[PDB]
Amino acid sequence: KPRGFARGLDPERIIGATDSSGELMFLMKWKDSDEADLVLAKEANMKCPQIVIAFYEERLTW
Amino acid sequence: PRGFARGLDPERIIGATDSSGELMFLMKWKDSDEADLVLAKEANMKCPQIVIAFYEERLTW
Amino acid sequence: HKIPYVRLERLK
């Protein structure tokens, strides 16, 4: 039942995003786990800002 | 002195360009009306939350 | 079924 950061794993990379709920969520791939789950962007911004920035930098468009 | 060497606290990114060959941000600094350019990679390290706020606003489907 | 991007505009 623990989900996201409550699983106690290290974030590895963001592999999706959705704001359909009213808040921005990231699908987080965790280190040494096949099972990605959603986390609040607000939480990821604080706990792993460079992983967040990497997700944005790979999809820049002009 | 330019960019972060002005020693001002970053406040908001108000623009971006790649014309130097690397991504730069136009940084508006708090208590200064003179914005100027900083490397994105430097902003990533020094003010990641300001970088993220900029990107978050421009995320689009 | 769109892909998210960060949409920037070049200064000037």
Q: Is residue A19 part of a domain?
A: yes
Contact B40, B24 (CB under 8 A): yes
Range of the domain at B36: 3-53
We report the CATH number of the domain holding residue B24 as 2.40.50.40
| C2 touches B: beta carbon within 8 Å | yes
Q: Is residue B60 part of a domain?
A: no
Q: Is residue B7 part of a domain?
A: yes
Q: Which two tokens stand for residue A17?
A: 């995003």
| A62 touches C: beta carbon within 8 Å | yes
Q: What is the resolution of this structure in A?
A: 1.8
Q: Is residue A62 part of a domain?
A: no
Contact B56, C8 (CB under 8 A): no
Domain count, chain A: 1
Which of these, B33, B47, B28, lies nearest to A49 by C-alpha position? B47
Q: Is B40 left (phi over 0), alpha (psi -120 to 50) or beta?
A: alpha
Contact yes or no for B61 and C3 at CB 8 A: yes
Which 8-state DSSP code applies to residue A28? E
Q: Is residue A27 part of a domain?
A: yes
